[PDB]
Amino acid sequence: QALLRILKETEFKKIKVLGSGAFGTVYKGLWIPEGEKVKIPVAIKELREATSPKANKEILDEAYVMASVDNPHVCRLLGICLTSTVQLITQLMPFGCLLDYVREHKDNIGSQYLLNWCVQIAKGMNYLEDRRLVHRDLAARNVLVKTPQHVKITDFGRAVPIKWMALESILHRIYTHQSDVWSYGVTVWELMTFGSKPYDGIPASEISSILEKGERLPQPPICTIDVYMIMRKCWMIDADSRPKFRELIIEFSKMARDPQRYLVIQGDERMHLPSPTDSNFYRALMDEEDM
Amino acid sequence: QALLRILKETEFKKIKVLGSGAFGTVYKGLWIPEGEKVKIPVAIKELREATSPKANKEILDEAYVMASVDNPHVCRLLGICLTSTVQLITQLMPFGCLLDYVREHKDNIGSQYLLNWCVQIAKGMNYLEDRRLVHRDLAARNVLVKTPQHVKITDFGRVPIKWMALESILHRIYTHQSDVWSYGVTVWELMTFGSKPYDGIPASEISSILEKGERLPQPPICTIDVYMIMRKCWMIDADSRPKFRELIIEFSKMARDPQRYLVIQGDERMHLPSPTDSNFYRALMDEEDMD
Ligand SMILES: CN1CCC(c2ccc(-c3ccc4c(c3)C(=O)N([C@@H](C(=O)Nc3nccs3)c3cc(F)ccc3O)C4)cc2)CC1
Ligand SMILES: CN1CCC(c2ccc(-c3ccc4c(c3)C(=O)N([C@@H](C(=O)Nc3nccs3)c3cc(F)ccc3O)C4)cc2)CC1
Ligand SMILES: */C=C/C(=O)Nc1cc(Nc2nccc(-c3cn(C)c4ccccc34)n2)c(OC)cc1N(C)CCN(C)C
Ligand SMILES: C=CC(=O)Nc1cc(Nc2nccc(-c3cn(C)c4ccccc34)n2)c(OC)cc1N(C)CCN(C)C
């Protein structure tokens, strides 16, 4: 209700293209408050099409729900502008997404960051499950980095990412919170391989077959089997044998309490988490919300 | 101890001059974390005198206390860089200082902002008094605007003749009650929206006119209730001046009926923001807790 602000086109401008989503493009933009002199960096998503008083009504009423979330590991929709092209505005995460982050930082990611990222993603997904919100598009590209010690899940509930979807989602359009657990396992697979393309070299029209014959993503080199068994149980075809996000929070937390025991990274002992000094400095500059 | 980060000169640099004080220059600068690609805006104060490692320890020992404060209306020291000239790092407040703010928004400000700013400055000063920290240089230039609904006090802990209590001018005594005097001048600055106190009088003479009973005049928009409070901050007996806690209570009740205590032309179409615009401001700029 009061969590979604309706904007004018005059109080924000799109400045640089950051990327394409499925149904729209995301820009880096600037918010100019009315009667003010300051300019605040923001992220604007302009939708591919459809300005219709009628489609606006489902866009708005679902934007209200995406403005309702309150969790440190879930992004909140902040505003909307209902012109000819719908424009959506969120906070800009200056570090980008976890996917390009682990791809451009593959030689400096320690084990202790990866397991904490897995935990944080699970807390965000567990909160959405507690809010009865299905993500439907969880992937390393939809996990944003506020600080390297703080990731947030974005772009949930929007409803093709075939290589992330559960088989019941591929064959029968079923989207549950257990289907999201499947996409969570692929997301962990992306993190542990430092941004590899899942099922690389296999047409998306062919994934349903290989999953029915038992084929799964291979064990990442840095993962022990305790981590790989977790990923594989997120890919049981029976959805209720897949773990719950609540359980995934507990298990990855305990592995975070002994990181190099569960992830084997070359040179893992010269790369570590920030001290309280470095953490408090990050929070005072960029991350003042409670965590 | 772990709240003050020691920086290297390679991970931050100065970008633009924001203003000077007397102890040194303040710059707008950018922090680049080591091994990272993003650039985070900061405020850097360069100590314009070059100091020695012996003076550095006295600089450091007070920097730790300036990094120890935790209150929504007091700025916290975040970092320090100890080269030839010491550099000090805080959060950058993009709206600037309350002084230039009310000067550039003169008579576009309602009573409800003016009274809340008075409350917030008293809250910060009362927190400093509870920490047994004297400000010694309180003025509208040292009140930073994080957002228009949130101000913070900076540059405390250690000649502004026209702000000082009389015992500070004659006997250089600096108590929390001398800070109450300078608070009254600050409220005067806001209520005249950035006028020069005692404008046109040499500072070498302010002691004389204060012993003769002369004070700053009543601002046009102020009724006598608020002007009497300012006059009690300028009593020659230090223990007849009000306490900061009392100023919090007294300005708070006046804030609950602003148009009763300030008479501004057109005050009734300029209001405080709605929860929607406030939830929008904080999610972008002010994630800190606050009342
Ligand atoms: C006939 N036919 C036509 C179309 C109809 C339709 C209905 C609803 C939408 C809709 C509504 C709301 C959103 C989204 C989509 C969405 O993509 N949204 C993201 C988000 O915007 N991200 C951002 N990136 C950068 C800046 S804004 C998002 C942000 C966030 F903070 C939290 C969750 C979230 O999903 C929000 C579109 C089309 C359906 C029927
Ligand atoms: C002969 N000579 C030799 C050396 C001796 C000496 C001793 C102590 C200092 C010292 C130490 C610490 C600070 C300050 C000064 C100061 O000016 N500081 C502000 C502050 O940094 N402001 C900012 N603006 C923009 C970016 S940083 C500040 C920031 C904050 F967040 C909270 C309180 C505060 O006071 C902090 C300097 C010199 C004195 C005698
Ligand atoms: C991971 C892809 C990407 O482009 N990442 C990225 C993201 C930045 N910030 C940001 N903040 C909030 C929301 C998004 C966002 C949300 N969705 C659904 C997106 C889709 C596509 C792109 C971005 C999306 N992003 C960011 O801030 C500067 C930069 C950035 N990078 C690394 C791209 C480099 N360009 C500057 C060329
Ligand atoms: C009233 C002086 C002042 O504070 N000016 C100021 C400040 C900031 N940001 C900022 N953030 C933290 C600390 C300080 C700061 C602290 N001190 C002690 C200062 C002394 C002089 C100038 C600035 C400072 N300044 C800031 O962020 C962009 C902008 C301005 N300006 C008003 C510049 C003028 N603008 C209208 C173009």
Swiss-Prot record, chain A:
Swiss-Prot/TrEMBL puts the cross-link Glycyl lysine isopeptide (Lys-Gly) (interchain with G-Cter in ubiquitin) at 16, 37, 54, 57, 213, 244, 254
> Domain Protein kinase: where?
12-263
What happens after mutating residue 6 to A?
A: Abolishes phosphorylation
* Outcome after substituting residue 4 to A: Abolishes phosphorylation
Q: Which residues carry this modification: Phosphotyrosine?
A: 282
- What does the entry list as the binding residues for ATP? 18-26, 45, 90-91, 155
Family the entry assigns? Belongs to the protein kinase superfamily. Tyr protein kinase family. EGF receptor subfamily.
| Complexes and interactors | Binding of the ligand triggers homo- and/or heterodimerization of the receptor triggering its autophosphorylation. Heterodimer with ERBB2. Forms a complex with CCDC88A/GIV (via SH2-like regions) and GNAI3 which leads to enhanced EGFR signaling and triggering of cell migration; binding to CCDC88A requires autophosphorylation of the EGFR C-terminal region, and ligand stimulation is required for recruitment of GNAI3 to the complex. Interacts with ERRFI1; inhibits dimerization of the kinase domain and autophosphorylation. Part of a complex with ERBB2 and either PIK3C2A or PIK3C2B.
Q: What is this protein called?
A: Epidermal growth factor receptor
This chain's source organism reads Homo sapiens (Human)
